[PDB]
């Protein structure tokens, strides 16, 4: 379907969210949020993907950790617009449905910024990950 | 029935390709660019829009007009995302399609900055104009 630049640095490993998509739109969002995000976690339908971030607890030596945030959409709720700081890792998110604006995960904002609109609703997100959320890409529902 | 929301301010007259693009697919994508988009005319089909922009002469009072830029689509080319910068007016569009990034209309992208998925590609456009292009909508075929 239509996806979004790749949004990020060349670290970590590929990740792509594509076919675990095939179980359904998203009806929840999961992060775990300190002045950065430092994983994402989204369910398709009633199956969550893979904790795509802060691959062990040994992470601690290079950032903080943060605490776990999950967002339960209601049916019908779809994810319009994605609000992203990042450089050579993704730093924040800052994720608006239909239905509601969600609070930024990461509280720091001061990596160059991008908006992403998503017409209809994410489908999905591919990128790269280990300790942190090194990319993302929004892959639309067409 | 998948659409991004309006882009731009309040000012010029509505305008809508809805009926216009029962003659097809977008084929062409006509242009006038400056250091600001002053208008845009897309070809559904073989049929063209009105211009939406630059009413009429008089406008150099109040803004650059810029040179006539054509893109051809091939068949099989559809677009699939823009980045938009805007204000009270639209300030530059910088179209992409399945196959390319094409060149942006508008040379200064100083304003609000969003990146607009079209899922499945532009169906057509929506908007309001006058001098130049207050706002657009995108239509996806999603
Ligand atoms: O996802 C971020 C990062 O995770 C792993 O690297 C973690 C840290 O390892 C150190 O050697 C380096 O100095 C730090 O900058 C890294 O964050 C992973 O090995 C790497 O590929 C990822 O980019
Ligand atoms: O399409 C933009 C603009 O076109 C016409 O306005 C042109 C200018 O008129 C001046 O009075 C005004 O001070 C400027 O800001 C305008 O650019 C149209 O009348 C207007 O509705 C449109 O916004």
């Avoid at 179980?23 to 969002?29: A, F, K, M, Y």
């Avoid at 617009?81 to 450089?87: E, K, P």
Wanted: glycine share 12%.
């Amino acid at each position: 379907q239509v996806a979004s630049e790749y949004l990020g640095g060349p670290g970590g490993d590929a990740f792509d969210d594509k076919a675990l998509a095939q179980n359904g739109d998203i009806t929840r969002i999961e992060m775990q949020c300190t002045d950065v995000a430092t994983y994402i976690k989204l369910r398709y339908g009633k199956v969550d993907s893979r904790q795509w971030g802060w691959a062990n607890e040994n992470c601690i030596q290079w950032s903080k950790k943060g605490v776990k945030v999950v967002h339960e959409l209601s049916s019908g709720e779809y994810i319009t617009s994605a609000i992203v700081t990042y450089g050579k890792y993704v730093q924040s998110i800052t994720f608006k449905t239909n239905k509601r604006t969600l609070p930024r995960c990461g509280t720091s904002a001061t990596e160059k910024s991008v908006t992403v609109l998503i017409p209809g609703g994410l489908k999905y997100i591919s990128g790269r990950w280990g300790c942190r959320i090194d990319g993302l890409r929004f892959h639309a529902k067409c």
